[PDB]
Design a protein around this ligand. Sequence first.
Ligand SMILES: NC(=O)c1ccc[n+]([C@@H]2O[C@H](COP(=O)([O-])OP(=O)(O)OC[C@H]3O[C@@H](n4cnc5c(N)ncnc54)[C@H](O)[C@@H]3O)[C@@H](O)[C@H]2O)c1
Ligand SMILES: NC(=O)c1ccc[n+]([C@@H]2O[C@H](COP(=O)([O-])OP(=O)(O)OC[C@H]3O[C@@H](n4cnc5c(N)ncnc54)[C@H](O)[C@@H]3O)[C@@H](O)[C@H]2O)c1
Ligand SMILES: NC(=O)c1ccc[n+]([C@@H]2O[C@H](COP(=O)([O-])OP(=O)(O)OC[C@H]3O[C@@H](n4cnc5c(N)ncnc54)[C@H](O)[C@@H]3O)[C@@H](O)[C@H]2O)c1
Ligand SMILES: NC(=O)c1ccc[n+]([C@@H]2O[C@H](COP(=O)([O-])OP(=O)(O)OC[C@H]3O[C@@H](n4cnc5c(N)ncnc54)[C@H](O)[C@@H]3O)[C@@H](O)[C@H]2O)c1
Lengths: 236, 236, 236, 236
Amino acid sequence: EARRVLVYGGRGALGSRCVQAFRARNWWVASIDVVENEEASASVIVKMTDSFTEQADQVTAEVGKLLGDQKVDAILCVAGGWAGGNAKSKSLFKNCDLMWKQSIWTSTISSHLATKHLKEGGLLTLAGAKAALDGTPGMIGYGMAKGAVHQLCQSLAGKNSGMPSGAAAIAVLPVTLDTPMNRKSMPEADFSSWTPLEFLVETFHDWITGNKRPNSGSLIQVVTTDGKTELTPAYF
Amino acid sequence: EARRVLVYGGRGALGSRCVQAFRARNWWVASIDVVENEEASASVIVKMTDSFTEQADQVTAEVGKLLGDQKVDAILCVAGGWAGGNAKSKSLFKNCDLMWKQSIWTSTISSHLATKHLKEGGLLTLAGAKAALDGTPGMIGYGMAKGAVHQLCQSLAGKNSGMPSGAAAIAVLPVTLDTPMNRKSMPEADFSSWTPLEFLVETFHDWITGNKRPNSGSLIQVVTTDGKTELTPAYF
Amino acid sequence: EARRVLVYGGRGALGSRCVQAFRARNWWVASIDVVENEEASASVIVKMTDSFTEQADQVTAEVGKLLGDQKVDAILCVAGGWAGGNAKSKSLFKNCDLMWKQSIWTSTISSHLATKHLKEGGLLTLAGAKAALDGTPGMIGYGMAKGAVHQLCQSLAGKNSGMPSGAAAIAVLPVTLDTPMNRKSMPEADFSSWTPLEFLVETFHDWITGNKRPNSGSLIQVVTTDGKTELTPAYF
Amino acid sequence: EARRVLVYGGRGALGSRCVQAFRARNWWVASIDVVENEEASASVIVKMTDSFTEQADQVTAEVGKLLGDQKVDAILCVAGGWAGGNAKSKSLFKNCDLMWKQSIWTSTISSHLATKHLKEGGLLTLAGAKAALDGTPGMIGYGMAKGAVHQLCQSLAGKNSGMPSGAAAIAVLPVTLDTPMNRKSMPEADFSSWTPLEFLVETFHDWITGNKRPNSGSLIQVVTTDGKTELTPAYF
Ligand SMILES: NC(=O)c1ccc[n+]([C@@H]2O[C@H](COP(=O)([O-])OP(=O)(O)OC[C@H]3O[C@@H](n4cnc5c(N)ncnc54)[C@H](O)[C@@H]3O)[C@@H](O)[C@H]2O)c1
Ligand SMILES: NC(=O)c1ccc[n+]([C@@H]2O[C@H](COP(=O)([O-])OP(=O)(O)OC[C@H]3O[C@@H](n4cnc5c(N)ncnc54)[C@H](O)[C@@H]3O)[C@@H](O)[C@H]2O)c1
Ligand SMILES: NC(=O)c1ccc[n+]([C@@H]2O[C@H](COP(=O)([O-])OP(=O)(O)OC[C@H]3O[C@@H](n4cnc5c(N)ncnc54)[C@H](O)[C@@H]3O)[C@@H](O)[C@H]2O)c1
Ligand SMILES: NC(=O)c1ccc[n+]([C@@H]2O[C@H](COP(=O)([O-])OP(=O)(O)OC[C@H]3O[C@@H](n4cnc5c(N)ncnc54)[C@H](O)[C@@H]3O)[C@@H](O)[C@H]2O)c1
């Protein structure tokens, strides 16, 4: 059930594949990002600023004029990334602002675009990370941004949150996805414990089209061991 | 057993009461807030800026000079505030920008200053909220903020976080505090279910001065019933 | 407010999604169909027979054993199915026999169990159709099978019926539920007028957890215009 | 203006009287029922079976053999009966089954026979009931069955049901007919209200001979107050 999709983080490794395969199946796919994704039906360009309200208003404004009264089947917020740093760090403040702008800013503008552009029965997927289900001493910024996003699921799953009737919020919780960049930077890493980008496209495919879709509020873990990926509930 | 205290959020309702209880015991108290505290030993002024890196680098420069080589006993992060609104509200991006600046920008800089300026065995307290242990649909922004602080507290409590030996990070999680503004906003409320500011200040002295302090990464729910307040832990 | 639910029709398209969401809500869901449902907490297997009292006594008996002295919060009766044909049709006697078996046999056994097994205050939902509120000249068996279910919903709402005190028998009148088979079967159709199953699962959830439940003997029309689904009262 | 007629249920209280009277007129009258009516020109005897398709294929092929190329002028389907019991009852299933057999099966086979045999401009009359225009809590099987017959009658009045051009299907809906066994089961009732079979043979005869005929799909309530009996439209 799905010929309309919004991918926040459209040019980034996983979002890019979601743009590629939903077009291979003739869905209209649109990419919200800091750059244009030429393979998308359309791209919306996010404005670099320090003002959350200023980037928030320009993005919500231009998805306004692009969709008009067209609702979407799914918004997949897959924007995100990584920066390390413990609390004693040099870089703690540079990385915290990078992380907050990458997951807490993007998941909050997407949530709003959900309450306005999203179908009843539709789907908002949020980008969590399983590291954050506990203390992340070595990456304050990361854990904080993604633990914020897991609390946000619980809230959109809540009575009177703004989510369209029958639509759902599901935070996907990876350990390490498997991108060319990750392979380049973490060379001697067991790539067989990284999830393939395709298993998440496959998963958003079943979920978007009613197939075995998990309750709103759901924090779904994605663990790959030796090539085999597993989806497991986490409870907040 | 303690004498040197930082209060982040020093001119707020709990912040002022901490300067007063402690100043009148002849503790050295410095206040950090966007304005001055004439009843504190010292005042650091927080520069209004949308740049988290602007403000952090500043507070860490000014606190860093005040203290020089003196390790303080306890840093109390009691900055904060409150703003409602679900994902559909029009003022959401503004109300989220406030709640992150008051609760996410301030609890992070205080985690940083604690790795740099805190005594071995000393204490950092962060201000969380019991409401955000669950989903907060009627207040998207506020539960992201406080949800991120409960996660930060788990992080500082762990291996190689940056905290000094024997130093505890503890999050206090109130349901409602008895303030003049709560009275004036929720005028027809049952004020006996509110936690009196004085309970927390009596509690901050007990944990500060060695007597009865809990573990680092403790989330301590603060609940007051018919004037009687008990404290009970939450697990993450 | 509901943990125990019987889904008469547990393997069909809508009743299936009801065993999924409610077991993921850790409710006790017992499927009642012509085949076991492996996701349910229980299965009563309806023995195929041209004798009404044989199907009706083996179901009442197997469900009567399965629960014993326990009462259930709800009996969702979503069994039904469809076949066409006018009064001249050579498939008339086959189709008619199947529709009266799928909707009158199952509605009358679900009634009877509610009087014996529905918790005081509980829900029974019967499966109806918007179509059958007027004449159905192209599907005689169907409009005559649903129309009898609409008249049953009223009799249950009547004084001295057997219905448990405080309980409600509500009927649901859909035009087209969006489902797998309807997209494989009706393929150039406008899906924007088709109800997403996830909206009826959420509604069943409201009505079962006491929230916005309509009165007993209500004919609720479910109608989706442009993706927005609405519930309106029909009067018999 | 009419001389061949089938009387379905033709051996029962109004069924017998339509035979006797249309015969006093010399109309060729055929009686369908589970015993032969020796007063009519030809009697079909319905096989007592559980399979709807077994009985329906047998009654259709016997009426079919008897008439061959002959179109009839009016099928008066006056078969039926009565049984009590609300949804909690012991006898619920037996009587539901009996009432479906008597009033739902018989009426669906009449309708298939009118499309095959009724003349253009001819008449099909179905036995409905005032009681079932609303809920019937004490008699669940009876109101389901008669509620099924009211719907069928709008379906047959509709476009391409298969009814011969100009023909009509009109449901008659009594409160109580004055019958001998009604006098035995109800010995003290005010019979001045019990409609007399006679008034419906008088009326069937007018409708059959085009005199003041209701439109097709009309539902005629028949209410007798104290010696006059009025026919008034009911609506779906
Ligand atoms: N190895 C992993 O990729 C990995 C590991 C753990 C968790 N997950 C998480 O799941 C999600 C999917 O993984 P990913 O590889 O696609 O992340 P990613 O880093 O590859 O994608 C980042 C996207 O965010 C965009 N961008 C950055 N800030 C933006 C902003 N404020 N507004 C609009 N665009 C912005 C970038 O242009 C980019 O398209 C991520 O959020 C990630 O943190 C992934
Ligand atoms: N009923 C309540 O007031 C209540 C209930 C539950 C939780 N809390 C939480 O408990 C804590 C203390 O309670 P409070 O009522 O005294 O709050 P408060 O607002 O009265 O005091 C906090 C002070 O922190 C300052 N602060 C805001 N932004 C800052 C920034 N960017 N840099 C430095 N300081 C900044 C504000 O100026 C304010 O004066 C807060 O974290 C609050 O959210 C309060
Ligand atoms: N588009 C639609 O699917 C649509 C439209 C209008 C109304 N409805 C009505 O809403 C209800 C649910 O829709 P649906 O698509 O899920 O129906 P469905 O046909 O897909 O499912 C009916 C299920 O109940 C079972 N059922 C049939 N006879 C049974 C019996 N005698 N004993 C026990 N179970 C029996 C069937 O085996 C099947 O698993 C149906 O009753 C249907 O009539 C559906
Ligand atoms: N008090 C009333 O007389 C009254 C009230 C309301 C409605 N009506 C309805 O009007 C109709 C005619 O009135 P009635 O009193 O003469 O009913 P009746 O019981 O006296 O006669 C009905 C006849 O239909 C036959 N019928 C039952 N099963 C049949 C079958 N399987 N195949 C063919 N025919 C079958 C019965 O054998 C019987 O011969 C009935 O259906 C009745 O329910 C009558």
